[PDB]
Design a protein around this ligand. Sequence first.
Ligand SMILES: OC[C@H]1O[C@@H](O[C@H]2[C@H](O)[C@@H](O)[C@@H](O)O[C@@H]2CO)[C@H](O)[C@@H](O)[C@H]1O
Length: 143
Amino acid sequence: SQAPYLSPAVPFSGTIQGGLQDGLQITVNGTVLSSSGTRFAVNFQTGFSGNDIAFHFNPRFEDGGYVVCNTRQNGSWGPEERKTHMPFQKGMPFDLCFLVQSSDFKVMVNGILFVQYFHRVPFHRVDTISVNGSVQLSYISFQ
Ligand SMILES: OC[C@H]1O[C@@H](O[C@H]2[C@H](O)[C@@H](O)[C@@H](O)O[C@@H]2CO)[C@H](O)[C@@H](O)[C@H]1O
């Protein structure tokens, strides 16, 4: 029920005005760049530190393309999960939707379930979404 971020410049760090509460659905619509950059990441975190990211979703256009999901606590990366699926094209706007559940995040890419990720830390300590890399952001919205 929070008014969306329209065309946010991309290194971006903005507030989830009440934190992640269960049921919440968050769309990130953007478009991957053809710059030399070969990664971007959408991070759900505690604050603007970026030292503790409950859920780091990091698509990479290297090694053939693969997305890495992980969780940062006090500046130290837990074990990754990887899909080798890569749901994005350079040059095409994705509708990327994170749905918040009791046990997990369900990440839909263009309304098809891409990965589901199980919370390692609790989710209602998360107050900030940040995005960086070779992506341009049309919008981030809250539902
Ligand atoms: O796991 C998310 C972070 O990975 C970092 O690099 C990893 C690399 O992914 C992995 O293959 C292994 O070699 O350990 C590295 C530790 O730094 C990224 O640089 C970071 O941005 C996160 O994406």
